[PDB]
């Protein structure tokens with residue numbers, strides 16, 4: 001299980017869902033889906049998110065060790 | 067593009083493919099495949115690799131735009 005903090009980090013930076021989607025070249029539905037915990041992103045999308053949000057990836061997507 | 071440093075990092079830490087595969091509960095072939103850049107892991111598997119290698123995920127898998 002991964003717990004994500006994307007909503008909070010995105011909102012803190014004052015970035016809307018459509019703004020982030022446009023930067024990452026994905027759909028708003030994709031961003032919203034991640035934030036509503038419907039599913040995890042691909043490795044590549046996770047890495048793009050961390051890159052542009054200038055935040056260590058593990059601050060955004062936290063695997064609960066098991 | 068994704069730069070992949072898994073082999074280099076695993077090797078410096080003197081963890082065999084077999085031992086890493088066992089911690090991750092995947093085939094050794096799967097670790098080998100990821101090391102040789104044949105395919106990418108899911109995000110969760112990537113986070114587990116980072117956990118067992120005690121290394122930030124972005125030092126193992128480095129995405130660069132363009």
Ligand code: NA
Pocket residue numbers: 056057058122123124125
């Ligand atoms: Na990282």
